[PDB]
């Protein structure tokens, strides 16, 4: 598998999720996909992929794409961010 990270946004009181600006660190095979990331975050923080965007190297990746699609090798830094604050 490969080492993948999710940069959690600093939203400690700005929302009800466990977002505090920290970084999540998971390990998944390149064969998996963003679908696994969005769901795991939704389970961890609470925020569904409906508003939760995952940005890999500056690219808002979607459920339809995979880790292999973006070539997420060991050390893939994803950036979690809210799609639309409102």
Distance CA 25, CA 76 (A): 10
User: What is the DSSP annotation of 11-35?
Assistant: -SSSSSSS-SS-EEEEEE-TTSBHH
| Residue 47 CB neighbours (<10 A) | 22
CATH number of the CATH domain containing 59: 3.10.20.90
Q: 47, 11 in Cβ contact below 8 A?
A: no
Experimental method reported for this structure: NMR
What phi, psi does 35 have (nearest 5°)?
-55, -35
How far is CA 84 from its chain centroid? 16
Question: 23 pairs with which residues across the strands?
Answer: 7
CA distance 73 to 50: 26
Within a 10 A sphere around the Cβ of 58, how many other Cβ atoms? 6
Query: The domain containing residue 85 runs over which residues?
Result: 1-86
Is the separation of the CB atoms in 19 and 9 below 8 Å? yes
Find out whether 33 and 70 touch, Cβ atoms under 8 Å: no
Total of domains in the chain: 1
């Amino acid at each position: 598998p490969v080492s993948i990270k999710v940069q959690v946004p600093n939203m400690q009181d700005k929302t009800e999720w466990k977002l505090n600006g920290q970084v999540l660190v998971f390990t998944l095979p390149l064969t998996d996909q963003v679908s696994v990331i969005k769901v795991k975050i939704h389970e961890a923080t609470g925020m569904p992929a409906g508003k939760q965007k995952l940005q890999y190297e500056g690219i808002f990746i979607k459920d339809s794409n995979s880790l292999a699609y973006y070539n997420m090798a060991n050390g893939a830094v994803i950036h979690l961010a809210l799609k639309e604050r409102g």
